[PDB]
Amino acid sequence: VVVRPAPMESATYSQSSRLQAAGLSPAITLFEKAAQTVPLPDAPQPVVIADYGVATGHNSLKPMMAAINALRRRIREDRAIMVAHTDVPDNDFTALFRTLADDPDSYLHHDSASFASAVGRSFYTQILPSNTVSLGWSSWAIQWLSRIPAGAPELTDHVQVAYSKDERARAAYAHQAATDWQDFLAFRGRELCPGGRLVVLTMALDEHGHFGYRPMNDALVAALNDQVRDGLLRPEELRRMAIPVVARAEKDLRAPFAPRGWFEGLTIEQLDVFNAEDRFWAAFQSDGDAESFGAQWAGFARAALFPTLAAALDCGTGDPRATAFIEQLEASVADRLASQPEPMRIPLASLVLAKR
Amino acid sequence: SVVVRPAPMESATYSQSSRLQAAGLSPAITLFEKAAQTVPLPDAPQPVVIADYGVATGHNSLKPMMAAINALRRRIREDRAIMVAHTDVPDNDFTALFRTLADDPDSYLHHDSASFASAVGRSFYTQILPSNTVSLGWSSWAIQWLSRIPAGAPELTDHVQVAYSKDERARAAYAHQAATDWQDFLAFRGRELCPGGRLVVLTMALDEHGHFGYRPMNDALVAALNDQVRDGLLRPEELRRMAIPVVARAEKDLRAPFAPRGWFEGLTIEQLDVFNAEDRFWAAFQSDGDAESFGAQWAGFARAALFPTLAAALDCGTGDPRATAFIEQLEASVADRLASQPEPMRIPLASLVLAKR
Ligand SMILES: Nc1ncnc2c1ncn2[C@@H]1O[C@H](CSCC[C@H](N)C(=O)O)[C@@H](O)[C@H]1O
Ligand SMILES: Nc1ncnc2c1ncn2[C@@H]1O[C@H](CSCC[C@H](N)C(=O)O)[C@@H](O)[C@H]1O
Ligand SMILES: CCCCCCC[C@H](O)CC(=O)O
Ligand SMILES: CCCCCCC[C@H](O)CC(=O)O
């Protein structure tokens, strides 16, 4: 009965996450800095790094390598470092282990005393032993709600609650996000070693409380309506569609700490809210290729969002009809954005959290 | 890759088709539980690590893991973290594992609130866990799988088991691969275990007389494959290509790395037993006379464990519906053959307890 989002499209995520990779780039610096100074476990005990919301692992390679290189300047070369990559049970962990084995950038190919493991359990519960994680990393994951909130009204535009006209929808989604954030922090608070550090990068609202991706939103809503207009999509199926993604404002991120600055042994050591450079727009300004612009934006939306949309269909998710819906939606969104390229706001928040 | 590897179990059916395996490993659980009573445990915030080498879907791991956890909780505080590290090949269905751990009431996650689960998708013929971190190792029905079809090995004329091959060169090539694999497995477990740690192994064996067993199954499988060629469902070139890289080890093969002084890479054999598991499908048939059920049980067993590796030899994709068709028909053919003449079979196993210095 509890409706959850779908994981990323395993087949395309590694090729369609350049936006995410570019946006998280500043957080890597914070993560490296944290690795330079974090208190370390005693003796030859393995140093554990956790990666919360790994997907295919492609975008984890750079942050993990940065942390590992920093740690190696502090510990013996034979000392074990274990990376625990976490996601939901239905994530494609085979794609992860293939990434870790095949990609030359994989830390397994650069450090002979680094190890990899996977945890397929929602990070809104405790999923690692208490007091074991020296360094935590989570990028582009916590914006995903644990669920479509119980009793929340159907989203008439489907793809983002920030653009909904229903006040009841916004408040339900907002409450779910606050609970999820409290849960995330409580359990990371137990998992981290005393003195441990967790770096979080997530979708944010900007200074003016805006979600961003305005033209994407428009293109996506219109592309969905076109499929019901062309009879390719059923009105009942479209009505069911909702993306459980919530961007948080600065005050939303500070909410669990506000009492006096601490929550379950954790404190915000650093917080930044910024707009990521729109690389797809920048490239378009350089080469003038409109189709490429549309395809890059559409690919980003497909790998991250379309499986969650596809789950609302009457057929199975491994049905030929679902594949056709995915490919058509992508093509339509590509066409709409290519026909009038516009820059987009990509509001992010980076946090460094410390355990006392 | 020119290195040809076996295929993992059929995720869709393994948990329903692994009762033979579960019944066979039962005696090894006693050994595992006993080891759990005394193995050294790591200090400080480190969790106790139990490693499960060759997890598949996780269905058969639940009982052995719980036995160890229960034993550990008689020694240490309830709030001490225990981490179970389930290991398999990268192409194993780890989603099916995590669903098993979440959904099966027998899961240790449902019986012990300070137990944790992780997965490692890297061949256990390399070191896959940090040195000295594993207190307790478990591996059931996994080590009989070769790391590869040996390079330059002749084609197996009967396809499903080298022990039944009439080709001297093929038997030698497979035996050598099995021997180096065993050395590798031991070398890396010897690194992963803490000093004083224990590893319990359960694998396919040759019996007292050097026999592989499953003779009626072997006959049914060979005949069924030939039937698929004869009936135009399988190409001769596809069948020629089929080989199951499974090797059963004799007592002497298992002891080989350790002879004559008893130690290899810091490990020793503390206990070894060679035995034939009770044939439960035969026992059931003797009780109820249901020949169809007999055939289906045996065929499902063969299907979940062996058929993905056979299907890998087909000209179509393994995601192609024709592969699914091949799987289904081979199972029905084997089921019918055995149903028509039910016979008891030998299921030769070896259980080992290995100890690190
Ligand atoms: N409750 C939860 N527990 C664990 N993972 C979750 C989750 N909710 C969403 N995710 C995962 O978060 C990921 C978002 S994609 C982000 C991937 C990568 N960190 C990057 O920066 O590109 C998906 O794999 C999704 O399955
Ligand atoms: N080199 C290797 N590394 C890790 N796992 C392997 C392997 N070769 C085979 N396996 C795994 O061994 C398993 C055999 S099935 C045994 C499952 C379970 N332990 C039980 O007792 O029923 C399969 O999942 C297979 O993928
Ligand atoms: C307006 C719709 C744009 C939403 C874009 C959503 C981006 C995803 O969160 C990225 C991810 O999960 O890796
Ligand atoms: C005659 C061939 C019968 C072989 C039966 C092989 C059984 C598999 O090893 C079981 C498994 O991998 O779990």
Short mmCIF file of N, CA and C in Angstrom, two decimals, chain A residues 148-211:
data_model
loop_
_atom_site.label_atom_id
_atom_site.label_comp_id
_atom_site.label_asym_id
_atom_site.label_seq_id
_atom_site.Cartn_x
_atom_site.Cartn_y
_atom_site.Cartn_z
N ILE A 148 5.34 8.44 -1.62
CA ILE A 148 4.21 9.36 -1.82
C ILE A 148 3.49 9.38 -0.47
N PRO A 149 3.31 10.58 0.12
CA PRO A 149 2.72 10.64 1.46
C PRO A 149 1.32 10.01 1.48
N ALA A 150 1.01 9.30 2.56
CA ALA A 150 -0.32 8.74 2.74
C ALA A 150 -1.37 9.86 2.71
N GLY A 151 -2.42 9.66 1.93
CA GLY A 151 -3.55 10.59 1.87
C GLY A 151 -3.32 11.86 1.06
N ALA A 152 -2.15 11.97 0.43
CA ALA A 152 -1.85 13.12 -0.42
C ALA A 152 -2.70 13.09 -1.69
N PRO A 153 -3.23 14.25 -2.11
CA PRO A 153 -4.01 14.34 -3.35
C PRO A 153 -3.15 14.05 -4.57
N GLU A 154 -3.78 13.63 -5.67
CA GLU A 154 -3.08 13.38 -6.92
C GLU A 154 -2.52 14.68 -7.50
N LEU A 155 -1.28 14.63 -7.98
CA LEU A 155 -0.65 15.79 -8.59
C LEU A 155 -1.15 15.96 -10.02
N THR A 156 -1.89 17.04 -10.26
CA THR A 156 -2.51 17.30 -11.57
C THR A 156 -1.49 17.57 -12.69
N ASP A 157 -0.29 18.00 -12.32
CA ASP A 157 0.80 18.18 -13.28
C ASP A 157 1.91 17.12 -13.15
N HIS A 158 1.85 16.36 -12.06
CA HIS A 158 2.52 15.05 -11.94
C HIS A 158 4.01 15.03 -11.59
N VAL A 159 4.80 15.90 -12.21
CA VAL A 159 6.26 15.73 -12.16
C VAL A 159 7.00 16.42 -11.01
N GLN A 160 6.39 17.45 -10.43
CA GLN A 160 7.00 18.15 -9.30
C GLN A 160 5.98 18.94 -8.49
N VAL A 161 5.90 18.62 -7.20
CA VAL A 161 4.92 19.24 -6.29
C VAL A 161 5.12 20.75 -6.10
N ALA A 162 6.36 21.22 -6.28
CA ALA A 162 6.66 22.66 -6.18
C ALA A 162 5.84 23.48 -7.17
N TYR A 163 5.51 22.87 -8.31
CA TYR A 163 4.71 23.53 -9.34
C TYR A 163 3.21 23.23 -9.24
N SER A 164 2.82 22.46 -8.23
CA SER A 164 1.40 22.16 -8.02
C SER A 164 0.64 23.37 -7.51
N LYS A 165 -0.64 23.43 -7.85
CA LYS A 165 -1.53 24.48 -7.38
C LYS A 165 -2.26 24.06 -6.10
N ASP A 166 -2.14 22.77 -5.76
CA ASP A 166 -2.81 22.21 -4.59
C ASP A 166 -1.97 22.41 -3.32
N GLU A 167 -2.45 23.31 -2.46
CA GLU A 167 -1.79 23.61 -1.18
C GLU A 167 -1.68 22.39 -0.27
N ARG A 168 -2.72 21.55 -0.28
CA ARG A 168 -2.75 20.29 0.48
C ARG A 168 -1.65 19.32 0.03
N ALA A 169 -1.38 19.30 -1.27
CA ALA A 169 -0.30 18.49 -1.82
C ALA A 169 1.07 18.97 -1.34
N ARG A 170 1.31 20.28 -1.44
CA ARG A 170 2.60 20.86 -1.04
C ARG A 170 2.92 20.58 0.42
N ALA A 171 1.93 20.76 1.30
CA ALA A 171 2.12 20.57 2.74
C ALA A 171 2.36 19.11 3.12
N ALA A 172 1.67 18.19 2.44
CA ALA A 172 1.86 16.76 2.67
C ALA A 172 3.26 16.34 2.24
N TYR A 173 3.67 16.79 1.05
CA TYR A 173 5.01 16.49 0.54
C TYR A 173 6.09 17.13 1.43
N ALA A 174 5.84 18.36 1.87
CA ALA A 174 6.77 19.04 2.78
C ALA A 174 6.92 18.31 4.12
N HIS A 175 5.81 17.85 4.69
CA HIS A 175 5.86 17.11 5.95
C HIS A 175 6.62 15.79 5.79
N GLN A 176 6.39 15.09 4.68
CA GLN A 176 7.11 13.84 4.39
C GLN A 176 8.62 14.09 4.33
N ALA A 177 9.01 15.17 3.66
CA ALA A 177 10.42 15.55 3.51
C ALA A 177 11.09 15.85 4.85
N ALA A 178 10.36 16.51 5.75
CA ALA A 178 10.89 16.88 7.06
C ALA A 178 11.10 15.64 7.90
N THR A 179 10.15 14.71 7.84
CA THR A 179 10.26 13.45 8.56
C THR A 179 11.42 12.60 8.03
N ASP A 180 11.50 12.48 6.70
CA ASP A 180 12.58 11.77 6.03
C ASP A 180 13.96 12.32 6.41
N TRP A 181 14.08 13.65 6.45
CA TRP A 181 15.34 14.32 6.78
C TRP A 181 15.71 14.04 8.24
N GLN A 182 14.74 14.14 9.14
CA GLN A 182 14.94 13.77 10.53
C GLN A 182 15.39 12.31 10.66
N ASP A 183 14.73 11.41 9.93
CA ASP A 183 15.08 9.98 9.94
C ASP A 183 16.50 9.75 9.43
N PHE A 184 16.80 10.31 8.26
CA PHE A 184 18.15 10.22 7.66
C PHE A 184 19.23 10.63 8.66
N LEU A 185 19.03 11.78 9.30
CA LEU A 185 20.01 12.31 10.26
C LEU A 185 20.15 11.46 11.51
N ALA A 186 19.02 10.99 12.04
CA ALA A 186 19.03 10.15 13.24
C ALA A 186 19.89 8.90 13.02
N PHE A 187 19.70 8.24 11.89
CA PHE A 187 20.40 6.99 11.63
C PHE A 187 21.84 7.16 11.16
N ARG A 188 22.14 8.23 10.43
CA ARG A 188 23.55 8.55 10.13
C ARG A 188 24.26 8.93 11.43
N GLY A 189 23.55 9.63 12.31
CA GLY A 189 24.05 9.99 13.64
C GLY A 189 24.51 8.81 14.47
N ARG A 190 23.87 7.66 14.29
CA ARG A 190 24.28 6.44 14.98
C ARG A 190 25.42 5.72 14.25
N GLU A 191 25.36 5.73 12.92
CA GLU A 191 26.33 5.02 12.08
C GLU A 191 27.73 5.63 12.09
N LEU A 192 27.80 6.96 12.10
CA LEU A 192 29.09 7.64 12.12
C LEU A 192 29.89 7.34 13.39
N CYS A 193 31.21 7.22 13.24
CA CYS A 193 32.12 7.21 14.39
C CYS A 193 32.00 8.55 15.11
N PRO A 194 32.27 8.57 16.44
CA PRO A 194 32.40 9.87 17.11
C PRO A 194 33.45 10.72 16.40
N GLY A 195 33.09 11.97 16.09
CA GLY A 195 33.96 12.85 15.33
C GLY A 195 33.86 12.68 13.83
N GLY A 196 33.08 11.69 13.39
CA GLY A 196 32.92 11.40 11.96
C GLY A 196 32.27 12.53 11.19
N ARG A 197 32.43 12.52 9.87
CA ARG A 197 31.87 13.56 8.99
C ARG A 197 31.03 12.98 7.85
N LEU A 198 29.91 13.64 7.57
CA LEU A 198 29.02 13.28 6.49
C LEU A 198 28.82 14.49 5.57
N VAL A 199 29.05 14.29 4.28
CA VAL A 199 28.84 15.34 3.29
C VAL A 199 27.59 15.00 2.48
N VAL A 200 26.64 15.93 2.46
CA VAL A 200 25.38 15.76 1.74
C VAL A 200 25.25 16.82 0.65
N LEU A 201 24.89 16.37 -0.54
CA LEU A 201 24.50 17.25 -1.63
C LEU A 201 23.12 16.85 -2.12
N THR A 202 22.20 17.81 -2.15
CA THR A 202 20.81 17.55 -2.55
C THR A 202 20.18 18.72 -3.30
N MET A 203 19.02 18.46 -3.90
CA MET A 203 18.23 19.49 -4.57
C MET A 203 17.70 20.48 -3.55
N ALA A 204 17.81 21.75 -3.89
CA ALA A 204 17.42 22.82 -2.99
C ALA A 204 16.44 23.77 -3.66
N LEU A 205 15.76 24.56 -2.85
CA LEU A 205 15.07 25.74 -3.36
C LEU A 205 16.08 26.88 -3.29
N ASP A 206 16.02 27.81 -4.24
CA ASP A 206 16.98 28.92 -4.23
C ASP A 206 16.58 30.01 -3.24
N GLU A 207 17.35 31.10 -3.20
CA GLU A 207 17.11 32.22 -2.28
C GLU A 207 15.67 32.72 -2.28
N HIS A 208 15.01 32.63 -3.43
CA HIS A 208 13.65 33.13 -3.60
C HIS A 208 12.61 32.02 -3.43
N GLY A 209 13.05 30.85 -2.99
CA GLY A 209 12.16 29.71 -2.77
C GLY A 209 11.74 28.98 -4.04
N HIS A 210 12.56 29.08 -5.09
CA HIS A 210 12.23 28.45 -6.37
C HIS A 210 12.96 27.13 -6.59
N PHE A 211 12.24 26.18 -7.20
CA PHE A 211 12.72 24.82 -7.46
C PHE A 211 13.70 24.75 -8.64
#
